Write an enzyme that holds these catalytic residues in place. Structure first.
Site, PDB file in Angstrom:
ATOM      1  N   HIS A  64       0.866  -1.181   0.000  1.00 48.85           N
ATOM      2  CA  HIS A  64       0.000   0.000   0.000  1.00 48.85           C
ATOM      3  C   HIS A  64       0.908   1.239   0.000  1.00 48.85           C
ATOM      4  O   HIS A  64       1.896   1.267   0.730  1.00 48.85           O
ATOM      5  CB  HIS A  64      -0.830  -0.015   1.284  1.00 48.85           C
ATOM      6  CG  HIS A  64      -1.595   1.262   1.491  1.00 48.85           C
ATOM      7  ND1 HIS A  64      -2.433   1.771   0.511  1.00 48.85           N
ATOM      8  CD2 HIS A  64      -1.670   2.079   2.554  1.00 48.85           C
ATOM      9  CE1 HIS A  64      -2.991   2.867   0.975  1.00 48.85           C
ATOM     10  NE2 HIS A  64      -2.552   3.078   2.187  1.00 48.85           N
ATOM     11  N   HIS A  66       0.941   4.590   1.225  1.00 49.17           N
ATOM     12  CA  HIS A  66       0.147   5.294   2.189  1.00 49.17           C
ATOM     13  C   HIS A  66      -0.022   6.777   1.950  1.00 49.17           C
ATOM     14  O   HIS A  66       0.971   7.451   2.005  1.00 49.17           O
ATOM     15  CB  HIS A  66       0.743   4.996   3.604  1.00 49.17           C
ATOM     16  CG  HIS A  66      -0.075   5.644   4.693  1.00 49.17           C
ATOM     17  ND1 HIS A  66      -0.677   4.864   5.638  1.00 49.17           N
ATOM     18  CD2 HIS A  66      -0.405   6.922   4.975  1.00 49.17           C
ATOM     19  CE1 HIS A  66      -1.337   5.634   6.510  1.00 49.17           C
ATOM     20  NE2 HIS A  66      -1.178   6.890   6.131  1.00 49.17           N
ATOM     21  N   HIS A 109       4.089   0.319   2.724  1.00 47.35           N
ATOM     22  CA  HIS A 109       4.258  -0.813   3.615  1.00 47.35           C
ATOM     23  C   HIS A 109       3.391  -1.987   3.161  1.00 47.35           C
ATOM     24  O   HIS A 109       2.422  -1.766   2.417  1.00 47.35           O
ATOM     25  CB  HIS A 109       3.786  -0.366   5.040  1.00 47.35           C
ATOM     26  CG  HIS A 109       2.374   0.123   5.178  1.00 47.35           C
ATOM     27  ND1 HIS A 109       1.287  -0.727   5.261  1.00 47.35           N
ATOM     28  CD2 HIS A 109       1.856   1.387   5.285  1.00 47.35           C
ATOM     29  CE1 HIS A 109       0.163  -0.009   5.426  1.00 47.35           C
ATOM     30  NE2 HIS A 109       0.489   1.257   5.429  1.00 47.35           N
ATOM     31  N   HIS A 111       0.517  -4.542   3.155  1.00 38.19           N
ATOM     32  CA  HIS A 111      -0.859  -4.398   3.636  1.00 38.19           C
ATOM     33  C   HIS A 111      -1.520  -5.787   3.608  1.00 38.19           C
ATOM     34  O   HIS A 111      -2.688  -6.004   3.305  1.00 38.19           O
ATOM     35  CB  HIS A 111      -1.636  -3.370   2.789  1.00 38.19           C
ATOM     36  CG  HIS A 111      -2.601  -2.589   3.641  1.00 38.19           C
ATOM     37  ND1 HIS A 111      -3.607  -3.255   4.344  1.00 38.19           N
ATOM     38  CD2 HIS A 111      -2.772  -1.272   3.879  1.00 38.19           C
ATOM     39  CE1 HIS A 111      -4.298  -2.359   5.026  1.00 38.19           C
ATOM     40  NE2 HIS A 111      -3.823  -1.165   4.762  1.00 38.19           N
ATOM     41  N   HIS A 395      -6.269   4.899  19.671  1.00 34.64           N
ATOM     42  CA  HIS A 395      -6.239   4.204  18.388  1.00 34.64           C
ATOM     43  C   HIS A 395      -6.140   5.213  17.242  1.00 34.64           C
ATOM     44  O   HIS A 395      -7.040   6.013  17.036  1.00 34.64           O
ATOM     45  CB  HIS A 395      -7.563   3.433  18.161  1.00 34.64           C
ATOM     46  CG  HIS A 395      -7.792   2.370  19.211  1.00 34.64           C
ATOM     47  ND1 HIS A 395      -7.229   1.132  19.099  1.00 34.64           N
ATOM     48  CD2 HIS A 395      -8.484   2.376  20.375  1.00 34.64           C
ATOM     49  CE1 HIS A 395      -7.553   0.392  20.162  1.00 34.64           C
ATOM     50  NE2 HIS A 395      -8.344   1.131  20.941  1.00 34.64           N
ATOM     51  N   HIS A 398      -7.136   5.465  10.220  1.00 37.92           N
ATOM     52  CA  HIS A 398      -6.704   5.940   8.906  1.00 37.92           C
ATOM     53  C   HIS A 398      -7.741   5.603   7.835  1.00 37.92           C
ATOM     54  O   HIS A 398      -8.247   4.473   7.795  1.00 37.92           O
ATOM     55  CB  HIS A 398      -5.380   5.265   8.622  1.00 37.92           C
ATOM     56  CG  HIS A 398      -4.916   5.348   7.205  1.00 37.92           C
ATOM     57  ND1 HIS A 398      -4.776   6.586   6.583  1.00 37.92           N
ATOM     58  CD2 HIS A 398      -4.560   4.416   6.324  1.00 37.92           C
ATOM     59  CE1 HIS A 398      -4.354   6.396   5.332  1.00 37.92           C
ATOM     60  NE2 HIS A 398      -4.239   5.084   5.175  1.00 37.92           N
ATOM     61  N   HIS A 400      -8.300   5.230   3.748  1.00 31.15           N
ATOM     62  CA  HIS A 400      -7.684   5.122   2.437  1.00 31.15           C
ATOM     63  C   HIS A 400      -8.496   5.951   1.428  1.00 31.15           C
ATOM     64  O   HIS A 400      -9.680   6.212   1.606  1.00 31.15           O
ATOM     65  CB  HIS A 400      -7.722   3.671   1.922  1.00 31.15           C
ATOM     66  CG  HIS A 400      -6.744   2.783   2.633  1.00 31.15           C
ATOM     67  ND1 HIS A 400      -5.921   1.913   1.922  1.00 31.15           N
ATOM     68  CD2 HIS A 400      -6.455   2.612   3.949  1.00 31.15           C
ATOM     69  CE1 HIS A 400      -5.154   1.205   2.819  1.00 31.15           C
ATOM     70  NE2 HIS A 400      -5.519   1.655   3.985  1.00 31.15           N
ATOM     71  N   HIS A 452      -9.439   1.990   8.926  1.00 30.65           N
ATOM     72  CA  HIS A 452      -9.059   1.078  10.014  1.00 30.65           C
ATOM     73  C   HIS A 452      -8.082   1.685  11.008  1.00 30.65           C
ATOM     74  O   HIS A 452      -7.449   2.712  10.769  1.00 30.65           O
ATOM     75  CB  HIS A 452      -8.343  -0.120   9.356  1.00 30.65           C
ATOM     76  CG  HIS A 452      -7.070   0.204   8.654  1.00 30.65           C
ATOM     77  ND1 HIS A 452      -5.832   0.223   9.251  1.00 30.65           N
ATOM     78  CD2 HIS A 452      -6.871   0.555   7.341  1.00 30.65           C
ATOM     79  CE1 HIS A 452      -4.910   0.529   8.330  1.00 30.65           C
ATOM     80  NE2 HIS A 452      -5.524   0.746   7.163  1.00 30.65           N
ATOM     81  N   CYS A 453      -7.922   0.964  12.111  1.00 29.17           N
ATOM     82  CA  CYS A 453      -6.932   1.396  13.114  1.00 29.17           C
ATOM     83  C   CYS A 453      -5.552   1.050  12.539  1.00 29.17           C
ATOM     84  O   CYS A 453      -5.319  -0.026  11.974  1.00 29.17           O
ATOM     85  CB  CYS A 453      -7.152   0.624  14.424  1.00 29.17           C
ATOM     86  SG  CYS A 453      -5.869   1.131  15.603  1.00 29.17           S
ATOM     87  N   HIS A 454      -4.612   1.996  12.687  1.00 28.01           N
ATOM     88  CA  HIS A 454      -3.293   1.817  12.119  1.00 28.01           C
ATOM     89  C   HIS A 454      -2.326   1.119  13.080  1.00 28.01           C
ATOM     90  O   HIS A 454      -1.141   1.004  12.784  1.00 28.01           O
ATOM     91  CB  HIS A 454      -2.706   3.111  11.532  1.00 28.01           C
ATOM     92  CG  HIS A 454      -1.914   2.781  10.278  1.00 28.01           C
ATOM     93  ND1 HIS A 454      -0.799   1.983  10.272  1.00 28.01           N
ATOM     94  CD2 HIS A 454      -2.134   3.171   8.994  1.00 28.01           C
ATOM     95  CE1 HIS A 454      -0.330   1.884   8.995  1.00 28.01           C
ATOM     96  NE2 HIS A 454      -1.108   2.644   8.274  1.00 28.01           N
ATOM     97  N   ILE A 455      -2.854   0.624  14.218  1.00 28.29           N
ATOM     98  CA  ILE A 455      -2.012  -0.251  15.058  1.00 28.29           C
ATOM     99  C   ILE A 455      -2.205  -1.591  14.348  1.00 28.29           C
ATOM    100  O   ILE A 455      -3.319  -2.137  14.314  1.00 28.29           O
ATOM    101  CB  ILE A 455      -2.458  -0.266  16.529  1.00 28.29           C
ATOM    102  CG1 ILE A 455      -2.169   1.114  17.118  1.00 28.29           C
ATOM    103  CG2 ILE A 455      -1.679  -1.386  17.249  1.00 28.29           C
ATOM    104  CD1 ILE A 455      -2.796   1.405  18.489  1.00 28.29           C
ATOM    105  N   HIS A 458      -4.059  -4.487  15.821  1.00 34.67           N
ATOM    106  CA  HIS A 458      -5.518  -4.325  15.986  1.00 34.67           C
ATOM    107  C   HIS A 458      -6.231  -4.543  14.662  1.00 34.67           C
ATOM    108  O   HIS A 458      -7.331  -5.104  14.628  1.00 34.67           O
ATOM    109  CB  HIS A 458      -5.926  -2.958  16.535  1.00 34.67           C
ATOM    110  CG  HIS A 458      -5.314  -2.650  17.870  1.00 34.67           C
ATOM    111  ND1 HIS A 458      -5.387  -1.406  18.416  1.00 34.67           N
ATOM    112  CD2 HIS A 458      -4.604  -3.433  18.739  1.00 34.67           C
ATOM    113  CE1 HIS A 458      -4.768  -1.372  19.610  1.00 34.67           C
ATOM    114  NE2 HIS A 458      -4.272  -2.606  19.794  1.00 34.67           N
ATOM    115  N   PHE A 463     -10.181  -4.668  13.493  1.00 32.26           N
ATOM    116  CA  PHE A 463     -10.616  -3.279  13.722  1.00 32.26           C
ATOM    117  C   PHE A 463     -10.585  -2.458  12.431  1.00 32.26           C
ATOM    118  O   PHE A 463      -9.757  -1.563  12.196  1.00 32.26           O
ATOM    119  CB  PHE A 463      -9.693  -2.665  14.795  1.00 32.26           C
ATOM    120  CG  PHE A 463     -10.308  -1.668  15.742  1.00 32.26           C
ATOM    121  CD1 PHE A 463     -11.691  -1.507  15.840  1.00 32.26           C
ATOM    122  CD2 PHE A 463      -9.508  -0.881  16.544  1.00 32.26           C
ATOM    123  CE1 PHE A 463     -12.246  -0.610  16.723  1.00 32.26           C
ATOM    124  CE2 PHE A 463     -10.055   0.036  17.433  1.00 32.26           C
ATOM    125  CZ  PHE A 463     -11.432   0.193  17.506  1.00 32.26           C
TER     126      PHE A 463
HETATM  127 CU   LIG Z   1      -6.202   0.274  17.588  1.00 30.48          CU
HETATM  128 CU   LIG Z   2      -0.817   2.776   6.131  1.00 30.75          CU
HETATM  129 CU   LIG Z   3      -3.368   4.176   3.663  1.00 27.52          CU
HETATM  130 CU   LIG Z   4      -4.199   0.921   5.467  1.00 22.98          CU
END
Ligand SMILES: [Cu+2]
Ligand SMILES: [Cu+2]
Ligand SMILES: [Cu+2]
Ligand SMILES: [Cu+2]
Ligand SMILES: *[C@@H]1O[C@H](CO)[C@@H](O[C@@H]2O[C@H](CO)[C@@H](O)[C@H](O)[C@H]2NC(C)=O)[C@H](O)[C@H]1NC(C)=O
Ligand SMILES: *[C@@H]1O[C@H](CO)[C@@H](O[C@@H]2O[C@H](CO)[C@@H](O)[C@H](O)[C@H]2NC(C)=O)[C@H](O)[C@H]1NC(C)=O
Ligand SMILES: *[C@@H]1O[C@H](CO)[C@@H](O[C@@H]2O[C@H](CO)[C@@H](O)[C@H](O)[C@H]2NC(C)=O)[C@H](O)[C@H]1NC(C)=O
Ligand SMILES: *[C@@H]1O[C@H](CO)[C@@H](O)[C@H](O)[C@H]1NC(C)=O
Ligand SMILES: *[C@@H]1O[C@H](CO)[C@@H](O)[C@H](O)[C@H]1NC(C)=O
Ligand SMILES: *[C@@H]1O[C@H](CO)[C@@H](O)[C@H](O)[C@H]1NC(C)=O
Length: 499
Positions: A64, A66, A109, A111, A395, A398, A400, A452-455, A458, A463
């Site tokens: 992906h 980002h 990164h 995905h 949290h 993010h 897309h 989604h959560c970027h952790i 998670h 998530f």
């Molecule tokens: Cu999270």
């Molecule tokens: Cu990302």
């Molecule tokens: Cu992204």
């Molecule tokens: Cu993403």
């Protein structure tokens, strides 16, 4: 640096960025992944060659880019099982897209599951030949990019489902762990009297970092790719996946200064030079800094950031004053995260392929309960209230395909319908503060987009939700190349050991 046309050979190799040797994922033989660069308006042709051999960190991959909107190229966004089936080992896949209207600091990164934590993550800078902030600095190049990385001595799929902190903080790919007190520290070289545009990129899988440079104040001028009015700060709390550009005036006394990046959890503090790096003026002796940390008196606060160019907030200046308002209720059951009672599990057929195959409504799209159709050319308001039912806060969420207006930020009770910052990753705060982070955007980009959560641990635990934006125009807006249509048949023929 490489790009805008380049090949990225993904493979496994033993690395020891903090002096501890472990098998990981490298790109073009290095970790973190190489810096990719281009200029606003360029066509990017990134050929991803998958030569991965270790199933424990997954042999398949997907990348992906980002922060890029991918308008017309939703098939190249990256999320496995949303926008494509993963690329298989022994195969390659060309991501081909344009960036006509964006410039700033981004990153790329894996995905696919938690693979990016195992090594596939690196910075990506799109320069603006006519940068409005260009007169504020002298130097802006590969040596002014700073990456912050959380590094683990145990592979992502071999460790706990929710790690309790990283083993080391790496700054520009180097750092010390509490078991490797003598490893090399990264050094950033500056010349007295010059102004530098540093591009700070968090490529974290989890922790947020409180970043600061002893004896120097920083002028923030860019936020997740969006130019901002200059803001003087002395510390920056940066959440996973966020980016900031800041100007550093190297006008202090020639010496060695500590660069600090303190994580919110795991091994905190700076004992032995952990969580640190060195800022060295030319002429200074080769040695570790002896500077002391001063209390932060003008920390970065998100409500003090404002875009440089006018970016009007979509909709009326009142709560719910939009075409479609959605509240996301979070929950967690011990092992999985939920949004509005649904935990995301990757479907067998990528959502974009579902749409191209005839699926148009929420009950037609899989997974059931996690896919939300959005009307075309409309104003959207999303609230993401912090809650005790969703541990691991704050949290960072993010979205897309879009940048969004942060109408209400974490730690603030005010709503700004005038000139709030726009960005792509936002902290949703904590239930102790009573946060109710509110963002707005308009649906101008047909396709399925992840929220989604970027952790990463998670996201892996569910998530996330998928927005199926303007379902009726998806097929026409996003013509797909034959190579993308071949990815699923290839991947589906793989035995589990080769995935
Ligand atoms: Cu999270
Ligand atoms: Cu990302
Ligand atoms: Cu992204
Ligand atoms: Cu993403
Ligand atoms: C494939 O990658 C995995 C994960 O990095 C490697 O796992 C290591 O396994 C050894 C022996 O079981 C453990 O002692 C290490 O702690 C594991 N490393 C990590 C980083 O967790 C595995 O060695 C790799 N396989 C090959 C053949 O290289
Ligand atoms: C970083 O900026 C802060 C601005 O708040 C500077 O702190 C102020 O410095 C002036 C010195 O002229 C004092 O009069 C103020 O009382 C300061 N106070 C605080 C703590 O707010 C700080 O000096 C700057 N540092 C560097 C290295 O430039
Ligand atoms: C976070 O803000 C949202 C949006 O304002 C709140 O949801 C709205 O709550 C009121 C009830 O008081 C309703 O009039 C709206 O219909 C609600 N939902 C939606 C989708 O707009 C939400 O309750 C706030 N949460 C917290 C914890 O403060
Ligand atoms: C360093 O430059 C900053 C502006 O970025 C200014 O606050 C100050 O005058 C300068 N300090 C020194 C040591 O010259
Ligand atoms: C959490 O919910 C997931 C999804 O339905 C389920 O598979 C799992 O068993 C649940 N975990 C616990 C601890 O109940
Ligand atoms: C989740 O399910 C519970 C139990 O029925 C229900 O009361 C609640 O409204 C649901 N939450 C959302 C946001 O749909």
């Amino acid at each position: 640096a490489i790009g805008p046309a380049a090949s990225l050979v993904v493979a496994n190799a033993p690395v020891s960025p903090d002096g501890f040797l472990r098998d990981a994922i490298v790109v073009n033989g290095v970790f973190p992944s190489p810096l990719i660069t281009g200029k606003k308006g360029d066509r990017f042709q990134l050929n991803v060659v998958d030569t991965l051999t270790n199933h424990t960190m997954l042999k398949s991959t997907s990348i992906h880019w980002h922060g890029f909107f991918q308008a017309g190229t939703n098939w190249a966004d990256g999320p496995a099982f949303v926008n494509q089936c993963p690329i298989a080992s022994g195969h390659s896949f060309l991501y081909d897209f344009h960036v006509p209207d964006q410039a700033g600091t981004f990153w790329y990164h894996s995905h696919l599951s938690t693979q990016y934590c195992d090594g596939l993550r690196g910075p990506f800078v799109v320069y603006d030949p006519k940068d409005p902030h260009a007169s504020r600095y002298d130097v802006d190049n590969e040596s002014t990019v700073i990456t912050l990385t959380d590094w683990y001595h145990t592979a992502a799929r071999l460790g706990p489902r929710f790690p309790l902190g990283a083993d080391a903080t790496l700054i520009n790919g180097l750092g010390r762990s509490a078991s490797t007190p003598t490893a090399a520290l990264a050094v950033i070289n500056v010349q007295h009297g010059k102004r530098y545009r540093f591009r700070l990129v968090s490529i974290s899988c989890d922790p947020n970092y409180t970043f600061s440079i002893d004896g120097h104040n920083l002028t923030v001028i860019e936020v997740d790719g969006i130019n901002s009015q200059p803001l003087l700060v002395d510390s920056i709390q940066i959440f996973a996946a966020q980016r900031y550009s800041f100007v550093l005036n190297a006008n202090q006394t020639v010496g060695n200064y500590w660069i600090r990046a303190n994580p919110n959890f795991g091994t905190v503090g700076f004992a032995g030079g952990i969580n640190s790096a060195i800022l060295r003026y030319q002429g200074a002796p080769v040695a570790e800094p002896t500077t002391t940390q001063t209390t932060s008196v003008i920390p970065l606060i998100e409500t003090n950031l404002h875009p440089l160019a006018r970016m009007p907030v979509p909709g009326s200046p009142t709560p719910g004053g939009v075409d479609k308002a959605l509240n996301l209720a979070f929950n967690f059951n011990g092992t999985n995260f939920f949004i509005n009672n649904a935990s995301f599990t990757p479907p067998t057929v990528p959502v974009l392929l579902q749409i191209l195959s005839g699926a148009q409504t929420a009950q037609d799209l899989l997974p059931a309960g996690s896919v939300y159709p959005l009307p075309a050319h409309s104003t959207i308001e999303i609230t993401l209230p912090a809650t005790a039912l969703a541990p691991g806060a704050p949290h960072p969420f993010h979205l897309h395909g879009h940048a969004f207006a942060v109408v209400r930020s974490a730690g603030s009770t005010t709503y700004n319908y005038n000139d709030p910052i726009f960005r792509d990753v936002v902290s949703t705060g904590t239930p102790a503060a009573g946060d109710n982070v509110t963002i707005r955007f308009q649906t101008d980009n047909p396709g399925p987009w992840f929220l989604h959560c970027h952790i990463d641990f998670h996201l892996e635990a569910g998530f996330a939700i998928v927005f199926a934006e303007d379902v009726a125009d998806v097929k026409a807006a996003n013509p797909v190349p034959k190579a993308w249509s071949d990815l699923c048949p290839i991947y589906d023929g793989l035995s589990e050991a080769n995935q």
